[PDB]
Amino acid sequence: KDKEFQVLFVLTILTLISGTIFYSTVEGLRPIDALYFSVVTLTTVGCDISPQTDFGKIFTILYIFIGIGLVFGFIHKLAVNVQLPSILSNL
Amino acid sequence: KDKEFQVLFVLTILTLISGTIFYSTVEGLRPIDALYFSVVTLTTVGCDISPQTDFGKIFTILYIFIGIGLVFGFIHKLAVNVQLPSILSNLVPR
Amino acid sequence: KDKEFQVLFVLTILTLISGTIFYSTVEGLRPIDALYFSVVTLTTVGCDISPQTDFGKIFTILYIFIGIGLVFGFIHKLAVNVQLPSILSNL
Amino acid sequence: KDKEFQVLFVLTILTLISGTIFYSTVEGLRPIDALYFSVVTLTTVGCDISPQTDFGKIFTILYIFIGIGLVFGFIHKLAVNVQLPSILSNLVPR
Ligand SMILES: [Cl-]
Ligand SMILES: [Cl-]
Ligand SMILES: [Cl-]
Ligand SMILES: [Cl-]
Ligand SMILES: [K+]
Ligand SMILES: [K+]
Ligand SMILES: [K+]
Ligand SMILES: [K+]
């Protein structure tokens, strides 16, 4: 497998783990909700809640700038790998 | 004409069918609401609601990562291969 | 002025007018709220409401695919024009 | 080093200051909440709230169109000029 894809995967996972830890401890979310919030924030889908604490709001601002580029780089490389078998079967 | 476009089109349709079936079954949404939720999620517009079940939350996370790349790949091919040539042709004085 | 920018502007305005007309009449929104909903939908910011009618939900799905590419093309060209005087003053 | 980056950085800071001042004044938000609202709007994440005043709604529409291009231009330059070289340097065996 492509090292470039593997590194993007690792960076993404590490970034989502850090968010899950932060929001589950600081904002009192269940782990699955902390992970969900991290994911929909960094992919810009968003959701129906926001952090309650000032610490949480500051973290989220920085989290977005730290992570959005990484996540969308991963989504793009993932898309190439997911769609390529179908392209190659059709070509 | 463009086989990458054809693939991205079919994959996008299949993805939206899968979301419509999932969210109507697991989250109890009307089929039209399940399709709406799938579309606004994968285009990253977002929705006034969120999944209520843990199954729905886990599925949505995976659906987001796989689906955004496909849907926006389709949107780009649509813009380049259909909308842009249509706009250009519609600006020609005749 | 660049014709490419002028056409993107016109297309964007026409698309937002169509959304404002639709959501103000079909979904019963005030004009400013119908315009706001159209804008945050096509730029993918989103907001705290969704269409109530099935007609509205179908329109919004199609609206997104019809308009998202146009709007982001305009946002990009706008950004070039807005930032260029500052770049040229700094270079 | 990269003067386009410097411009996009300063313009992004000025934009977020303007939003923080606007939403705290016109919409009554705490400064920290006004900054948060400005950031999630211009990165297109979105927020659980929306402007309540018609002034806030009109401003936000204009803020979105001007601000998204600047903020995401900054994000791209940040990725290419800072984060990517930092990642590459941090992967070198030493
Ligand atoms: Cl959990
Ligand atoms: Cl239905
Ligand atoms: Cl009005
Ligand atoms: Cl404050
Ligand atoms: K949203
Ligand atoms: K978005
Ligand atoms: K959003
Ligand atoms: K929302």
Side-chain angles (χ1 to χ4, degrees):
Chain A
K1 197 78 226 83
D2 157 30
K3 204 215 190 143
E4 297 85 330
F5 174 76
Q6 281 165 203
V7 172
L8 282 176
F9 178 71
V10 162
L11 283 162
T12 296
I13 300 279
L14 296 186
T15 299
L16 296 177
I17 291 168
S18 294
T20 301
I21 292 177
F22 180 91
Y23 294 113
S24 68
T25 57
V26 169
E27 291 290 334
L29 304 188
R30 297 161 68 225
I32 184 53
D33 292 336
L35 175 62
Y36 187 88
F37 184 83
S38 294
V39 168
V40 302
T41 293
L42 292 186
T43 63
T44 78
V45 172
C47 66
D48 52 346
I49 64 146
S50 41
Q52 267 193 87
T53 69
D54 289 359
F55 191 19
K57 294 168 201 164
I58 297 298
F59 176 92
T60 300
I61 290 159
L62 291 172
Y63 196 57
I64 287 167
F65 282 95
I66 289 173
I68 193 169
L70 173 62
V71 165
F72 272 89
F74 173 69
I75 283 171
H76 165 91
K77 295 270 307 183
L78 178 59
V80 173
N81 291 64
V82 163
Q83 83 189 37
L84 195 60
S86 288
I87 294 184
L88 291 172
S89 189
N90 184 264
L91 98 87
Chain B
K1 37 200 204 155
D2 172 342
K3 288 302 137 143
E4 271 169 17
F5 184 41
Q6 167 177 56
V7 169
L8 280 156
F9 172 68
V10 174
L11 294 184
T12 293
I13 295 286
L14 292 179
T15 297
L16 295 175
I17 294 174
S18 190
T20 298
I21 293 164
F22 178 89
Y23 292 112
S24 51
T25 297
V26 173
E27 292 288 330
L29 304 184
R30 294 176 57 221
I32 189 179
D33 290 339
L35 178 62
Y36 185 87
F37 185 82
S38 296
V39 170
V40 292
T41 296
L42 291 193
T43 59
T44 76
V45 172
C47 199
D48 47 329
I49 71 193
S50 288
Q52 285 187 295
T53 73
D54 287 353
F55 192 12
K57 289 161 184 174
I58 300 278
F59 172 82
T60 296
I61 287 163
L62 300 174
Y63 193 60
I64 281 168
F65 275 108
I66 296 277
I68 287 184
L70 301 178
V71 161
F72 274 94
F74 171 71
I75 290 174
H76 178 269
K77 289 294 235 193
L78 178 68
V80 158
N81 296 2
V82 179
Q83 300 167 319
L84 174 59
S86 158
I87 294 169
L88 288 167
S89 166
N90 282 340
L91 290 167
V92 170
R94 311 191 184 275
Chain C
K1 197 78 226 83
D2 157 30
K3 204 215 190 143
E4 297 85 330
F5 174 76
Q6 281 165 203
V7 172
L8 282 176
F9 178 71
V10 162
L11 283 162
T12 296
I13 300 279
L14 296 186
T15 299
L16 296 177
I17 291 168
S18 294
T20 301
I21 292 177
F22 180 91
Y23 294 113
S24 68
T25 57
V26 169
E27 291 290 334
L29 304 188
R30 297 161 68 225
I32 184 53
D33 292 336
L35 175 62
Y36 187 88
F37 184 83
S38 294
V39 168
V40 302
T41 293
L42 292 186
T43 63
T44 78
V45 172
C47 66
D48 52 346
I49 64 146
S50 41
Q52 267 193 87
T53 69
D54 289 359
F55 191 19
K57 294 168 201 164
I58 297 298
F59 176 92
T60 300
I61 290 159
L62 291 172
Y63 196 57
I64 287 167
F65 282 95
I66 289 173
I68 193 169
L70 173 62
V71 165
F72 272 89
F74 173 69
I75 283 171
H76 165 91
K77 295 270 307 183
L78 178 59
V80 173
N81 291 64
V82 163
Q83 83 189 37
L84 195 60
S86 288
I87 294 184
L88 291 172
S89 189
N90 184 264
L91 98 87
Chain D
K1 37 200 204 155
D2 172 342
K3 288 302 137 143
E4 271 169 17
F5 184 41
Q6 167 177 56
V7 169
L8 280 156
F9 172 68
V10 174
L11 294 184
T12 293
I13 295 286
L14 292 179
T15 297
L16 295 175
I17 294 174
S18 190
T20 298
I21 293 164
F22 178 89
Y23 292 112
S24 51
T25 297
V26 173
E27 292 288 330
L29 304 184
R30 294 176 57 221
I32 189 179
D33 290 339
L35 178 62
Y36 185 87
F37 185 82
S38 296
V39 170
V40 292
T41 296
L42 291 193
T43 59
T44 76
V45 172
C47 199
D48 47 329
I49 71 193
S50 288
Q52 285 187 295
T53 73
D54 287 353
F55 192 12
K57 289 161 184 174
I58 300 278
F59 172 82
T60 296
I61 287 163
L62 300 174
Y63 193 60
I64 281 168
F65 275 108
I66 296 277
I68 287 184
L70 301 178
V71 161
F72 274 94
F74 171 71
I75 290 174
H76 178 269
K77 289 294 235 193
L78 178 68
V80 158
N81 296 2
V82 179
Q83 300 167 319
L84 174 59
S86 158
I87 294 169
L88 288 167
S89 166
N90 282 340
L91 290 167
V92 170
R94 311 191 184 275

